[PDB]
Amino acid sequence: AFEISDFKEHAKKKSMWAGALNKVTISGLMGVFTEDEDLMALPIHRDHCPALLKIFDELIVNATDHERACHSKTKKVTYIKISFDKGVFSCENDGPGIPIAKHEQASLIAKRDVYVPEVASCFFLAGTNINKAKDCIKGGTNGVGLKLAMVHSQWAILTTADGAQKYVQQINQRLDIIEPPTITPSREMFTRIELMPVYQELGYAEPLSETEQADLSAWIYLRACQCAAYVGKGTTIYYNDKPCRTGSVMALAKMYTLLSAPNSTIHTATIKADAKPYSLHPLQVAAVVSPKFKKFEHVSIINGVNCVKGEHVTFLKKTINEMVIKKFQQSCSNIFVVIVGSIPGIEWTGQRKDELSIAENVFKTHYSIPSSFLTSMTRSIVDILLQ
Amino acid sequence: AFEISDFKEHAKKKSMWAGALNKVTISGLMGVFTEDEDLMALPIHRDHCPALLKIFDELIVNATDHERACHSKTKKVTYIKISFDKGVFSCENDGPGIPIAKHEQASLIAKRDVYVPEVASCFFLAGTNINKAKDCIKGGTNGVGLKLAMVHSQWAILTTADGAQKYVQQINQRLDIIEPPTITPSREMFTRIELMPVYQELGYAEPLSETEQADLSAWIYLRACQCAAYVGKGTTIYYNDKPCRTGSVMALAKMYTLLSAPNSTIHTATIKADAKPYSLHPLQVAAVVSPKFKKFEHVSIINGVNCVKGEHVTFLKKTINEMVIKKFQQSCSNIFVVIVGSIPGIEWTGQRKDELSIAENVFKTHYSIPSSFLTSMTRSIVDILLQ
Numbered sequence: 008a009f010e011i012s013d014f015k016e017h018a019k020k021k022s023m024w025a026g027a028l029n030k031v032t033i034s035g036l037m038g039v040f041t042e043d044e045d046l047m048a049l050p051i052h053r054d055h056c057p058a059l060l061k062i063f064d065e066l067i068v069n070a071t072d073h074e075r076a077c078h079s080k081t082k083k084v085t086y087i088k089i090s091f092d093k094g095v096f097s098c099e100n101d102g103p104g105i106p107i108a109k110h111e112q113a114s115l116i117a118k119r120d121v122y123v124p125e126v127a128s129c130f131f132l133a134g135t136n137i138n139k140a141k142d143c144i145k146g147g148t149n150g151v152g153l154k155l156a157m158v159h160s161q162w163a164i165l166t167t168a169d170g171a172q173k174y175v176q177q178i179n180q181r182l183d184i185i186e187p188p189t190i191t192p193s194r195e196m197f198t199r200i201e202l203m204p205v206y207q208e209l210g211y212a213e214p215l216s217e218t219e220q221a222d223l224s225a226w227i228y229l230r231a232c233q234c235a236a237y238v239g240k241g242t243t244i245y246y247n248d249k250p251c252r253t254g255s256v257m258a259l260a261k262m263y264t265l266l267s268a269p270n271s272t273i274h275t276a277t278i279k280a281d282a283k284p285y286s287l288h289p290l291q292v293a294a295v296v297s298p299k300f301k302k303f304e305h306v307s308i309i310n311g312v313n314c315v316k317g318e319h320v321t322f323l324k325k326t327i328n329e330m331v332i333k334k335f336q337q338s339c340s341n342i343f344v345v346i347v348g349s350i351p352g353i354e355w356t357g358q359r360k361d362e363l364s365i366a367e368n369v370f371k372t373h374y375s376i377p378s379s380f381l382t383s384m385t386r387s388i389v390d391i392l393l394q
Numbered sequence: 395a396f397e398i399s400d401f402k403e404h405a406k407k408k409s410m411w412a413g414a415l416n417k418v419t420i421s422g423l424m425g426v427f428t429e430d431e432d433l434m435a436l437p438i439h440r441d442h443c444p445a446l447l448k449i450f451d452e453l454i455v456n457a458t459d460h461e462r463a464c465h466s467k468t469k470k471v472t473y474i475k476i477s478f479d480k481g482v483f484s485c486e487n488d489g490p491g492i493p494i495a496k497h498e499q500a501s502l503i504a505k506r507d508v509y510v511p512e513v514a515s516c517f518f519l520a521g522t523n524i525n526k527a528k529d530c531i532k533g534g535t536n537g538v539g540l541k542l543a544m545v546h547s548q549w550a551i552l553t554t555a556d557g558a559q560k561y562v563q564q565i566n567q568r569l570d571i572i573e574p575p576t577i578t579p580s581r582e583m584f585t586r587i588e589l590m591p592v593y594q595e596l597g598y599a600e601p602l603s604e605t606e607q608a609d610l611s612a613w614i615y616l617r618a619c620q621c622a623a624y625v626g627k628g629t630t631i632y633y634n635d636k637p638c639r640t641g642s643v644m645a646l647a648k649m650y651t652l653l654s655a656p657n658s659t660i661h662t663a664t665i666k667a668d669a670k671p672y673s674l675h676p677l678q679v680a681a682v683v684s685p686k687f688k689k690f691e692h693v694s695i696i697n698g699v700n701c702v703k704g705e706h707v708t709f710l711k712k713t714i715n716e717m718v719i720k721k722f723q724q725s726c727s728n729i730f731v732v733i734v735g736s737i738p739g740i741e742w743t744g745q746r747k748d749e750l751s752i753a754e755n756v757f758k759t760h761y762s763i764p765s766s767f768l769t770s771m772t773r774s775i776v777d778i779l780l781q
């Protein structure tokens with residue numbers, strides 16, 4: 008009756024790692040769709056498998072983490088290329104590759120030659136964020152995300168090049184079959200993950216239906232557009248070899264409000280903090296206020312992660328609410344707001360990183376929302392309330 | 395740079411297991427306080443460590459799981475006794491004890507005699523829910539919760555008796571030191587976990603401050619009261635040897651609304667489904683509608699777990715909203731609602747079990763909310779809207 012599981016078997020059966028392992032109703036599920044030359048974020052009103060969307064997210068956050076790691080160094084990340092075609096998902100980024108070197112501890116554990124890229128892709132609770140600095144703004148913390156991608160892949164290829172050598176390794180049948188890597192001379196420098204998810208096991212048609220393909224493509228495109236707003240000014244994000252043109256929170260706010268509030272006013276702010284490490288990490292904000300909006304909604308890209316709940320939102324809402332109450336006397340259900348940037352020292356409620364955890368006083372003590380933004384938001388909210 | 399962690403080290407450092415490992419702002423944090431002979435649920439407006447509250451929850455859900463496992467058997471669980479004194483937390487339940495038997499697979503893994511209760515308390519990804527049936531309504535699924543309690547304990551004692559023998563085992567220094575167990579003849583039958591959390595490591599004073607002690611006591615008492623509404627009619631819940639008198643969703647609804655809406659109308663329903671396994675699991679509902687309530691709030695005890703988000707809430711809200719719209723023409727921000735019961739086949743977003751995951755169509759297809767409840771709720775909501 009009392010059974011003991013290994014990580015692989017556990018990750019194939021348990022929702023705690025990446026969420027539900029079958030299709031469920033995902034509240035607020037969105038994708039981006041192109042109408043003419045316009046990008047429009049629209050709801051996806053069909054059940055989808057959270058764990059499937061999460062293994063796409065794990066690879067994308069790994070690439071955005073690498074962009075952040077490299078952004079002040081000589082060899083920077085200049086691109087992240089995301090691809091989705093015939094069911095195959097890939098994510099490739101430039102900059103220094105995963106070191107092509109024997110890992111002494113892993114080789115002893117496994118009783119065979121294990122190189123660093125195999126540790127990164129095949130060993131659970133393993134990576135460069137196991138001892139994470141208090142000020143680190145990478146999303147990665149657990150050493151599990153890439154292994155979850157591998158466990159939900161029928162086949163996967165890890166390719167990395169360090170400017171000297173290229174390493175290619177097949178990781179097949181949900182991490183059951185790790186093929187010995189092919190190592191060759193190369194002047195390339197990059198990391199690529201290519202995989203075919205276990206679509207049928209996660210509740211999808213094999214091959215994907217027209218609707219499943221379209222929904223997954225829209226979701227991935229929007230996730231790439233979210234990255235594009237987060238990464239540094241030197242990095243381009245591509246989706247199926249097309250650049251994602253959403254380099255600002257204003258561009259993100261437009262994509263989400265184009266159908267409901269075309270030709271709208273975009274209230275903008277940079278939220279800044281008054282002490283390191285917070286002062287190193289300004290937050291970019293764009294908000295639209297419309298009577299057509301039925302309840303408060305945010306899109307938060309924090310540390311490269313799409314965060315659906317956190318005290319950073321609460322801080323903005325309470326601050327606006329206090330001003331609205333005062334002006335009206337002489338509050339948030341008509342706001343759509345985009346918040347993008349890094350926050351050091353956050354913790355998460357789970358591997359999925361749906362909710363960040365923090366002391367509210369971090370914002371009260373350190374951060375200031377520009378008066379001009381609060382005044383313009385309050386003016387717009389009050390006019391609606393008055394009507 | 396690339397490090398490989400064991401489970402214990404990982405659980406002491408990573409928020410993914412039990413949430414943040416220091417004090418943060420927990421939205422909606424509540425405890426129960428006794429004023430005179432009255433029980434009143436009130437907000438706790440102070441930061442607390444989620445992982446600390448979760449190891450209390452892991453033991454309480456294990457006891458409620460055992461109550462559910464035993465409820466149709468000859469030897470039932472008749473009590474769950476929760477204690478909190480001088481920093482020491484204990485949870486004891488009657489009914490069949492954890493088997494006192496050598497575990498052959500664990501003994502081979504560890505290269506020494508390992509009995510089943512040591513597997514349950516000290517081996518990660520281990521327990522009786524590793525292969526969980528599609529219709530199982532126990533909260534336990536991952537084989538990790540009791541190990542997280544042990545990893546966040548300076549010292550812990552596991553005591554179990556199977557009516558033949560008693561097994562006592564010390565598990566000390568955050569699972570670093572597993573003492574060999576003491577096995578003796580006994581006619582007792584029970585399972586007890588007693589532990590002292592690592593309060594200082596999780597941001598608390600050593601010993602607890604007056605306020606920390608009072609807040610943690612209030613939180614635990616309310617969690618016990620939540621259990622009392624969930625368990626079968628034959629089981630009594632005690633907190634510090636006093637029975638928890640909240641045997642109904644009406645009693646729970648009263649405790650949450652006593653300060654804001656004394657002498658209120660309680661709308662009641664049993665939500666029933668039309669096919670097994672759903673039909674085995676009626677949901678008990680009590681709701682209060684007041685103009686004094688500023689936004690929609692629910693307390694959901696699902697499969698013994700305090701669930702803060704799920705499509706069961708959405709189903710009730712949408713159903714009420716449709717009726718309200720219709721009546722008004724001739725909607726949920728004034729509702730407080732308690733929902734208690736079992737839902738088979740749910741998945742979670744994480745080990746914490748904050749959010750359940752399910753297809754919305756489960757409710758649309760199988761479940762029916764009684765017309766008399768919808769009519770009485772709609773009458774109360776409409777009167778407020780009209781005012």
Ligand SMILES: Nc1ncnc2c1ncn2[C@@H]1O[C@H](COP(=O)(O)OP(=O)(O)NP(=O)(O)O)[C@@H](O)[C@H]1O
Nearest residue numbers: 069073127134135136147148149150151152153198
């Ligand atoms: N695209 C990439 N480019 C470079 N290095 C990478 C890339 N993806 C992963 N890595 C490395 O591989 C390690 C393992 O990745 P992963 O399993 O996702 O763990 P993580 O990102 O550190 N933490 P988490 O994602 O929270 O579980 C990372 O710590 C990086 O060092």
Ligand SMILES: Nc1ncnc2c1ncn2[C@@H]1O[C@H](COP(=O)(O)OP(=O)(O)NP(=O)(O)O)[C@@H](O)[C@H]1O
Nearest residue numbers: 456460514521522523534535536537538539540585
């Ligand atoms: N109070 C208890 N009474 C009887 N059996 C218990 C009790 N607590 C734990 N157990 C047993 O010990 C096992 C390990 O507990 P635990 O680590 O909490 O895993 P779980 O409850 O199965 N899953 P999860 O809590 O989701 O990680 C359980 O599966 C039960 O078989």
Ligand SMILES: [Mg+2]
Nearest residue numbers: 069147152153
């Ligand atoms: Mg990662």
Ligand SMILES: [Mg+2]
Nearest residue numbers: 456534539540
């Ligand atoms: Mg458990």
